[PDB]
Write a protein that binds this DNA or RNA. Structure first.
Lengths: 112, 120, 55, 96, 68, 69, 100
RNA sequence: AGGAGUGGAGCCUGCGGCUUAAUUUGACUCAACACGGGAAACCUCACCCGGCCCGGACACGGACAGGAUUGACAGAUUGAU
RNA sequence: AGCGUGUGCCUACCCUACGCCGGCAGGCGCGGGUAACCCGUUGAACCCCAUUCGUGAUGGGGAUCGGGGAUUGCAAUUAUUC
């Protein structure tokens, strides 16, 4: 449910997946995306709203949930990020073969 | 010409009964129906239905009060009454005979039609 | 009496008292281990839960 | 939507206490779990925040069976001049 | 959908002209008179009032119907 | 003769209300008057017995082919 | 004290690695420690139809979920147990400590 | 080459057909027919006979604090307090 | 004998040893198990031993149908189940 919620919300910044790591009296969920400057917003507004909605939805104690956002290298080796990029390129208005050739050339230029 | 009865007791005695031994005069399903609990949850309709039975006209045939309840236990309090019970489309008018105590109004009103076949 | 007859029918039991937690469809529910999904949503979301095909 | 005034207000200072709001899409539920001190169903929250979405002050998101709402600055200012607030209280999502 | 059966209507509610001024009676002297009944419950202390019917007096919300 | 009341084929009869085991011609007479009583009170069971169909409430779409020709 | 530490996880390799790390710490701390007792594993089988509709050959899916559980006993006070369990923990392995 | 059989008997279930206010519907050789994970007394329910509420956002024009509007007990009417 | 399952999120509904009552279906007090810990050494059926039956639509087969008694559930008649 967490992965579904973030792949519906963060469709713009190239979402890849979550990584929930358990700690004694602490939970933190690492978010790996492409635009890590845009997931935070201005002075970390959006990440605060995401922590708040996770705390209010999943039934967690207050102050026990802290989200962390990091960028991942080799964007061309991630299937979800390239699929979202091709979706954004088709939705903005472009030739489908042109976008497919561009993303395939980017993937094999990334070293696949 | 014969005198009518139900487990040996008479009609006037059946009117002068209480529910606690009416359980033992009734059958197993009807005793469970009376012994389930206080009739208030779904059965305020049943309560005020017996109030509608208790409401009586002068010395004529009683008026045909009509229901939508097909699972009513026949009681001695409604002997000689007229009721039109719902079968889905219409209201089947029926005389409550003194032989029917221990039954349901859904039995004397047939829901489906008798099937008369033709050609394939 | 609409406030009393809006939801007067009991729903303590039956298949209408259960629902999927993804699409809310009352058909083909998986009540084993408290997944409480339909079979199609379970096949959609089976890999990331931890269920894999080996047998 | 017929709605008591106290429920509208109480929803509004909950929305301005923390700048998020969550609700499950079900109308036959008696009380909101977060507002268990008072008496209001989920239908009031859904229809009120649907009206506030239509007038254009929140986002909207549906993941599985729950709602997700996010305030914008015009929505912030609308709550500030609806709730009669001096310019010194902000929701915690904007401050650190 | 217009069908051959007659169409029902919602209850329109009849509009009274200044009913509160009919409750308090003002004479030429320095006194105030209460025509209809009052409320005795602990929920409504002295605020709401009862109905002036021909055979009962019905409360506004406390349902303290006293029939003569 | 110390035979318990639950060993009887006719317990709590609808007319006289006593436990009495009935024998052959009496059994046929009691069944005949029971069906006559059901037809007289015009219950669903009596109507199905008068028509000559399955009365216990089972599917008659496929089974029961030798009822008529 | 009778201290029991229960480890339950889904992977087997990370579970064996963290169990090796804990028994190595217990061996280098020079105290009496019980061996890694291996409880029988549990499989969670869900069998469902592949097609969403009711058309096609009757093919079925077979899902499994293996669960591995270990328990290792120690003879020490509590602070040693917490300081040895809060070192180099793995994300996919649950640790759970009680005292009888 | 053989084994268990099925098709004949009773019964359960599904489909076609007929009947019905309604007997909801998809699927018709393998590749439709104990299939839709469909073992439905109510919910399921998508079919029929009847009655309640708006859960018709938002924008415009009327409307209105002298009242825009909400709710209901005596008694009849269905079916329902 | 071996695969399993078992006190559930808004969700109320678990598996049962033991003692008493009743032919049985069942009812009441007491305890266990969030499980290699308790049901449970899962005293399963088919088999094995020994009576009764004797080629008879028969003690094969249990369709159809009547009466009574319990449990689930708000409600079982078009018979829920036993």
């Amino acid at each position: 449910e967490l992965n579904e919620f973030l792949t519906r919300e963060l469709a713009e910044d190239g979402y890849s997946g979550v990584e929930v790591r358990v700690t004694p009296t602490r939970t933190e969920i690492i978010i790996l995306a492409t635009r890590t400057q845009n997931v935070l917003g201005e002075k970390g507004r959006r990440i605060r709203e995401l922590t708040a909605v996770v705390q209010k939805r999943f039934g967690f104690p207050e102050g026990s949930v802290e989200l962390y956002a990091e960028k991942v290298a080799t964007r061309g080796l991630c299937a979800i990020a390239q699929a979202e990029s091709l979706r954004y390129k088709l939705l903005g208005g472009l030739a489908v073969r042109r976008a497919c050739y561009g993303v395939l050339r980017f993937i094999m230029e990334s070293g696949a | 010409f014969r005198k009518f009865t139900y487990r040996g007791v008479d009609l006037d005695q059946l009117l002068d009964m209480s529910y606690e031994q009416l359980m033992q005069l009734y059958s197993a399903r009807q005793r469970r129906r009376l012994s389930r609990g206080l009739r208030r949850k779904q059965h305020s309709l049943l309560k005020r239905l017996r109030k509608a039975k208790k409401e009586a006209p002068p010395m004529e045939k009683p008026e045909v009060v009509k229901t939508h309840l097909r699972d009513m236990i026949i009681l001695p309090e409604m002997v000689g009454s007229m009721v039109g019970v719902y079968n889905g489309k219409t209201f089947n008018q029926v005389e409550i005979k003194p032989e029917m105590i221990g039954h349901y109004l859904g039995e004397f009103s047939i829901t489906y039609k008798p099937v008369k076949h033709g050609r394939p | 009496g609409h406030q009393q007859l809006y939801w007067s029918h009991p729903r303590k039991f039956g298949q209408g008292s259960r629902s999927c937690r993804v699409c809310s469809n009352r058909h083909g529910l998986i009540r084993k281990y408290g997944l409480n999904m339909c079979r199609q949503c379970f096949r959609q979301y089976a890999k990331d839960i931890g269920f894999i095909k080996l047998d | 939507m017929l709605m008591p005034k106290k429920n509208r207000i109480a929803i509004y200072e909950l929305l301005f206490k923390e700048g998020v709001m969550v609700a499950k899409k079900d109308v036959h539920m008696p009380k909101h779990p977060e507002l268990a001190d008072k008496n209001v169903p989920n239908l009031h929250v859904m229809k009120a925040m649907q009206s506030l979405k239509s007038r254009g002050y929140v986002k909207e998101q549906f993941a599985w069976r729950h709602f997700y709402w996010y305030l914008t600055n015009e929505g912030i200012q609308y709550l500030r001049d609806y709730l009669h607030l001096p310019p010194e209280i902000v929701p915690a999502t904007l401050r650190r | 959908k217009s069908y051959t059966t007659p169409k029902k209507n919602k209850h329109k509610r009849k509009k009274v002209k200044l009913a509160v001024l009919k409750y308090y009676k003002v004479d030429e002297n320095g006194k105030i008179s209460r025509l209809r009944r009052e409320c005795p419950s602990d929920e409504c202390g002295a605020g709401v009032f009862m109905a002036s019917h021909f055979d009962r007096h019905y409360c506004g919300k406390c349902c303290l119907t006293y029939c003569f | 003769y110390k035979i318990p009341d639950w060993f009887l084929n006719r317990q709590k009869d609808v007319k006289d209300g006593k436990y009495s085991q009935v024998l052959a011609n009496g059994l046929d007479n009691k069944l005949r008057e029971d069906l006559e009583r059901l037809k007289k009170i015009r219950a669903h069971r009596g109507l199905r017995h008068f028509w000559g169909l399955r009365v216990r409430g089972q599917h008659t779409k496929t089974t029961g082919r030798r009822g008529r020709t | 004290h009778r201290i029991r530490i229960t480890l339950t996880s889904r992977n087997v390799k990370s579970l064996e690695k963290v169990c090796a790390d804990l028994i190595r710490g217990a061996k280098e701390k020079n105290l009496k420690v019980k061996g890694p007792v291996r409880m029988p594993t549990k499989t969670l089988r869900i069998t469902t139809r592949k097609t969403p509709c009711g058309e096609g050959s009757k093919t079925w899916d077979r899902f499994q979920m293996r669960i591995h559980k270990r328990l290792i006993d120690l003879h020490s006070p509590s602070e040693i147990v917490k300081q040895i369990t809060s070192i180099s923990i793995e994300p996919g392995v649950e640790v759970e400590v009680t005292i009888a």
